[PDB]
Amino acid sequence: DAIPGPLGPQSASLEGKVALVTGAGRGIGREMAMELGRRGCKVIVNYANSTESAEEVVAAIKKNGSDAACVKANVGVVEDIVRMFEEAVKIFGKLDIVCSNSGVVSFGHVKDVTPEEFDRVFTINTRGQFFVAREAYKHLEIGGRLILMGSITGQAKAVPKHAVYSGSKGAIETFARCMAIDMADKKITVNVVAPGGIKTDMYHAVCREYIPNGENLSNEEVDEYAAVQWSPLRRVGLPIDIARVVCFLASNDGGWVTGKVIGIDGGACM
Amino acid sequence: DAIPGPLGPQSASLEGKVALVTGAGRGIGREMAMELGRRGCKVIVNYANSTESAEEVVAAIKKNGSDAACVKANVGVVEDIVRMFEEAVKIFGKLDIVCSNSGVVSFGHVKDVTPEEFDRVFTINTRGQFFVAREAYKHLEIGGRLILMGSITGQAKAVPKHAVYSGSKGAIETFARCMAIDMADKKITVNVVAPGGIKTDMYHAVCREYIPNGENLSNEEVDEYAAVQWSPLRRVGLPIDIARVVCFLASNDGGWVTGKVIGIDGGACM
Amino acid sequence: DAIPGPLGPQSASLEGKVALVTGAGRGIGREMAMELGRRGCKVIVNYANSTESAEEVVAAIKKNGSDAACVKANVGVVEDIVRMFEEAVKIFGKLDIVCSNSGVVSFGHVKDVTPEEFDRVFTINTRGQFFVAREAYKHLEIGGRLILMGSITGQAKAVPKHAVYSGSKGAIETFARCMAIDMADKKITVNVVAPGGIKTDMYHAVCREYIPNGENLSNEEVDEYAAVQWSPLRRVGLPIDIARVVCFLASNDGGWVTGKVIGIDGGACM
Amino acid sequence: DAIPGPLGPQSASLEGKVALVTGAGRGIGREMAMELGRRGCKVIVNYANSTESAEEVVAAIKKNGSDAACVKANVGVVEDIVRMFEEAVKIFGKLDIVCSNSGVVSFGHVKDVTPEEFDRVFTINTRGQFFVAREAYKHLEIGGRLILMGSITGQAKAVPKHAVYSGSKGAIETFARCMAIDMADKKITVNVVAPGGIKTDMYHAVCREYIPNGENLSNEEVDEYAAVQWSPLRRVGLPIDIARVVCFLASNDGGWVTGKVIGIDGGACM
Ligand SMILES: NC(=O)C1=CN([C@@H]2O[C@H](COP(=O)(O)OP(=O)(O)OC[C@H]3O[C@@H](n4cnc5c(N)ncnc54)[C@H](OP(=O)(O)O)[C@@H]3O)[C@@H](O)[C@H]2O)C=CC1
Ligand SMILES: NC(=O)C1=CN([C@@H]2O[C@H](COP(=O)(O)OP(=O)(O)OC[C@H]3O[C@@H](n4cnc5c(N)ncnc54)[C@H](OP(=O)(O)O)[C@@H]3O)[C@@H](O)[C@H]2O)C=CC1
Ligand SMILES: NC(=O)C1=CN([C@@H]2O[C@H](COP(=O)(O)OP(=O)(O)OC[C@H]3O[C@@H](n4cnc5c(N)ncnc54)[C@H](OP(=O)(O)O)[C@@H]3O)[C@@H](O)[C@H]2O)C=CC1
Ligand SMILES: NC(=O)C1=CN([C@@H]2O[C@H](COP(=O)(O)OP(=O)(O)OC[C@H]3O[C@@H](n4cnc5c(N)ncnc54)[C@H](OP(=O)(O)O)[C@@H]3O)[C@@H](O)[C@H]2O)C=CC1
Numbered sequence A, B, C, D: 001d002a003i004p005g006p007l008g009p010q011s012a013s014l015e016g017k018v019a020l021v022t023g024a025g026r027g028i029g030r031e032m033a034m035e036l037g038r039r040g041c042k043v044i045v046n047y048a049n050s051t052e053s054a055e056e057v058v059a060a061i062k063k064n065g066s067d068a069a070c071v072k073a074n075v076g077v078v079e080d081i082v083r084m085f086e087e088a089v090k091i092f093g094k095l096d097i098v099c100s101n102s103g104v105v106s107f108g109h110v111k112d113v114t115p116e117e118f119d120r121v122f123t124i125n126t127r128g129q130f131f132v133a134r135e136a137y138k139h140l141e142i143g144g145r146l147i148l149m150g151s152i153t154g155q156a157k158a159v160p161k162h163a164v165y166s167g168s169k170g171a172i173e174t175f176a177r178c179m180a181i182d183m184a185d186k187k188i189t190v191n192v193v194a195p196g197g198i199k200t201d202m203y204h205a206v207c208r209e210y211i212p213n214g215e216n217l218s219n220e221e222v223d224e225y226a227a228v229q230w231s232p233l234r235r236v237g238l239p240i241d242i243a244r245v246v247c248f249l250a251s252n253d254g255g256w257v258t259g260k261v262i263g264i265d266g267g268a269c270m
């Protein structure tokens, strides 16, 4: 049968692809846009509040040799998502890759979860991603790429006071399986990246909630724990670790990988 | 170490246990309450609309030798759930087992899902179960049992136009893992039963949506397909098939089974 | 459709069933035969070396009110398995349940595994179980039950120096999926129980190999670790914990549970 | 923290890496060596019987601009594996990547499996891979890559008469989890690629055994079935599909992916 795409290194090229990354002003998302751009991608950085950071990222991508632009939209508002895509398409003309990154964390024993906090998390983490995914489908080029952001907590077995957040990410893994069927009519592949503890603002904010008796841990102590307890490779994961895998899925190399959950932890067990 | 519970058949006894089953007026739930009662349980049948059916079930359980009562509550309304448990506890004095059964189906290509239909399904299937689970925790006896209703679609790989429903059930499997940690402080075990196509009203309504080119299938033809394509055991699953496993988890036998997903299909592959 | 089996507690009855348990002279297996007998089963206890213990168990089952007999066979020798079943059938006339329990542990960094030690473990743990399963098929009554012994290590993510043993148990989970299809022509259900640290001779021998820096731990200290680190339920698992689940699968209640892996840990994460 | 490796496309470069691929004279393996070479790798093609094909591949890689050499060894013989690595290291001086590809298929109802045919498959598929993995550890450069060959059958739910082969591949997934811990002391990442039906000699030989009533299917009919039934993407998988993912895992991009099973099917459900 016919070979799908070029043979050799040329199959990993993202040059000439237009990508949209939600929540790209900081954290993993910022690095996702940065790296995508470094591999020759035109990046559209979406943001909700971090305008400054957003703009800063856009400047950076250009400085690196790629074109970029930023769009504002609150993924928790379906109308904002609908608008974000209508503008996105006009900016560079087409849309090849979509990275649904935006998300929020939450901690608390089941007995203390309020309907307000449950809806807060699920609305961004689960509902937002579905509608971003829905719009991505409509605007993606035939053969496009949809990448959903999940988490190690979707399958973790030992994280206490973490049902709401874990459930929101767990549902994303199921979305991938089902969306991979529907979206295949446009040759779009759908996959879920499931990171496991990356140094970002979030990490700084809630890492201690994962460490048994960690209220006291100093920043370096947290990293020491993370590095040793969570990976045989003995090191803390960085956004670039996710960004690299995301580029693989987005390239020709990931053409036969669809409906899957790629766990990107250093071999962690949570 | 000390043996947990009696040795012998006495370990499967549900006699003297009070159970609450949501959506017990029909389908799998009705049979869940019926069977639980047959094993000596006092059943509280919850219902949303099927009052007649509800009452009918209560009469049946008594006729079989057990006490029962019914409570009305819409699981999509947190206040209703809160009330349902406050009344439940007063009826028979205590609450040992809770079976979160209620749920709704949905079909449609991703591109046609509306925010209204997404919220419709997630609100009952996922959000409702969380709050039923939350209240169950607060009112369950030390050593109680919480059983969540999932589905084969949470892990299925070939069902098209089924992302919303599949995602709502998928999140339930994650809830089980996390809730099993928090709720363990009261010795409560949390598990998810994941049926795979049971003859109920739902089955009559949407089975054809699972069968490639099944609009034409006659009722008997659907059952023939179900029996042959979905199980090496060559037969259609019945509510009693789930009801029996639910009794196992609810008994002393299921004391060391927690945080798990029990797939109850005839060895189906979807 | 027709209801499969009796409604009510009578569905959990094992009375009048003949079962064969391999490696039933001690550990989990001994308790499996004991409990099966307590629920009205005629047990055939197989053994390899523990004759004394074997006979002792047979005396016990009778003293409890059930008939039993013991057969000697080395599961690592296919001819022994073939013979064991030919004799087994003649003893009580038929064979309803088979519990493939026998197994051996092993520890060591990959770099130190010798072909001899690899074959030692795989020959009993994997190859033995396949041939026990093969013979069980041929001799089981239509509607019989085949239960394979697996382990938490089949899916564990953090146990070092444990590839050979973990791999032997992992393959058992796959055997269950496939055997459930072939063996279904005789209505036999095939399932895998996956315990997670049970107090038996094995536990006494190698538990410390699972505890980071545990050479020094005293017996009570090991149990303290096991109870706290491996279960939210805060207690060490006992053979009776597995024995109870095995009876469920062997009864009418487990009729619709086939091709599955039932994890029997206190919600452990390894 | 410090960024692991270069930022940008340079992270996907395999230039200057020495790789060893077992069973590289034909099928997926041949393409694995070819592609690895195209990305600037020095490939050592191992073979068992296909000398001609082996040599042909070596000529090809050189013609493409990379150096290659071939080594003969029967993975079912531990002494051969030990020798293969001692020679391998001397050829190009070092060893960065190892791809354990070699394998054999088998079909048959459980009841017809003979100890000879069970050992035949397990000895190459499971035992061989363990010892190849063991030797890879000893000779791999710090930061090396070990990639094990698995299959969709390790998790498949509907393939009949396939327990022996499925079990041999299933154990490989467990090996990955455990080996990822031990081998991490040398910064080596261990992962399992799990293809799902690739056009190779094997495919030509046994594809019909997967298709219900396929004895009659013509070659083109088989491909039609494969393309439609096994993938929403509607096409048959090719060796290049696996080869591309293998290059990702072998590069810097796969540095944080370890202890995982990458399913490389077109979203197949078996
Ligand atoms: N950090 C970690 O350890 C891991 C993170 N993840 C997931 O990866 C993703 C990113 O995490 P990380 O970078 O650490 O997070 P950060 O806390 O650093 O915040 C990342 C971003 O998400 C955005 N976001 C939040 N709400 C919205 C919204 N309403 N609309 C659009 N964007 C929004 C933020 O936008 P703005 O700032 O502009 O409001 C921001 O850009 C999340 O989905 C997270 O759950 C998964 C596993 C691990
Ligand atoms: N049938 C099947 O093949 C399978 C079913 N399931 C799950 O099992 C559960 C029961 O399914 P099944 O019996 O077939 O369903 P049915 O369609 O027969 O309806 C079952 C019940 O769910 C209830 N329900 C719906 N909304 C509410 C609500 N707002 N509050 C309280 N109860 C409500 C109904 O209550 P009322 O009628 O009183 O409004 C009813 O009692 C569901 O969660 C379903 O998703 C999972 C796998 C397979
Ligand atoms: N203990 C634990 O923590 C867990 C155990 N398991 C599995 O459960 C099973 C039983 O474990 P456990 O009771 O702890 O083990 P023990 O170490 O207590 O030994 C149990 C038995 O296995 C038998 N056995 C060994 N070789 C043979 C053989 N060649 N033929 C027949 N029988 C043989 C022994 O027979 P004899 O003494 O007569 O030679 C004995 O009867 C094993 O498969 C084990 O891997 C799984 C998870 C956890
Ligand atoms: N084809 C498919 O659909 C899929 C294949 N796989 C796996 O991928 C791998 C390759 O499959 P594929 O290329 O299709 O297979 P082929 O039938 O085309 O044969 C591939 C190779 O395996 C080799 N091999 C067999 N025995 C030995 C041995 N004793 N020592 C060294 N090498 C040996 C052959 O060597 P020689 O010819 O030199 O003897 C050959 O080089 C296998 O492990 C297979 O199980 C997994 C999923 C799907």
Ligand SMILES: Cc1cccc2sc3[nH+]ncn3c12
Pocket: A105, A151, A152, A153, A195, A196, A197, A198, A202, A203, A206, A207, A210
């Ligand atoms: C923020 C964080 C820190 C450490 C480990 C994890 S695992 C996960 N999943 N989402 C966030 N996280 C974290």
Ligand SMILES: Cc1cccc2sc3[nH+]ncn3c12
Pocket: B105, B151, B152, B153, B195, B196, B197, B198, B202, B203, B206, B207, B210
């Ligand atoms: C209603 C139904 C029919 C057939 C197969 C399935 S699998 C599933 N999950 N929820 C509902 N169903 C069905």
Ligand SMILES: Cc1cccc2sc3[nH+]ncn3c12
Pocket: C105, C151, C152, C153, C195, C196, C197, C198, C202, C203, C206, C207, C210
């Ligand atoms: C023998 C043992 C002790 C503690 C934990 C485990 S987990 C497992 N699997 N087989 C044996 N074991 C053990």
Ligand SMILES: Cc1cccc2sc3[nH+]ncn3c12
Pocket: D105, D151, D152, D153, D195, D196, D197, D198, D202, D203, D206, D207, D210
């Ligand atoms: C050889 C083959 C053909 C079709 C589908 C599969 S799935 C698998 N796993 N190993 C081999 N195969 C095949």
